[PDB]
Amino acid sequence: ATQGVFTLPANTRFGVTAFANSSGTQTVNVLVNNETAATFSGQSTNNAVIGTQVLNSGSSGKVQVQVSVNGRPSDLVSAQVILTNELNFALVGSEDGTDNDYNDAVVVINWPLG
């Protein structure tokens, strides 16, 4: 199925944070309104934060995460969790290789902020 796409409440601030666990340099692209809204890049094998930023959900609430390593799109897994009907986590893992640890770039989106 389509992965890494999440519908957020409109005009809502959310945080997006990316970690790396791979030999390769990860390029995390965050699209709000089908237009690019933030880009994280970095390399780590120790869960290093390669980016963190607060964005606004925009008119449509459509937020998309895309991961590529060396210009090759990683395979994505994703899901959304809601705790006490109020605290939202949009979760993405990605695989750039063959071991299928899906942690090569990990992306968390959380809202609401404040």
Ligand X SMILES: C[C@@H]1O[C@@H](CC(=O)O)[C@@H](O)[C@H](O)[C@@H]1O
Residues that bind ligand X (CB under 6 A): 21-24, 45, 96-97, 99, 101, 104
Asked if residue 69 lies in contact with residue 26, where contact means CB atoms within 8 angstroms, the answer is yes
Identified binder of Ca ion from the candidate list 11, 36, 80, 101, rule CB under 5 A: 101
Burial tier of 111 (Cβ tally within 10 Å: 0-12, 13-18, 19+): buried
Q: Closest CB to Ca ion among 34 and 70?
A: 70
Q: Which amino acid is at 80?
A: Q
22 makes contact with Ca ion (CB under 5 A): yes
Nearest one of 56, 77, 83 to 65, comparing CA atoms = 77
Contacted entry of ligand X, Ca ion, none for residue 45, CB cut-off 5 to 8 Å set by kind = ligand X
Q: What is the C-alpha to C-alpha distance for residues 89 and 65, in angstroms, rounded to an integer?
A: 13
CB closer to ligand X, 22 vs 88: 22
Q: Report, in Å, the least distance between residue 95 CB and ligand X.
A: 6
Q: Does 97 bind Ca ion (CB under 5 A)?
A: yes
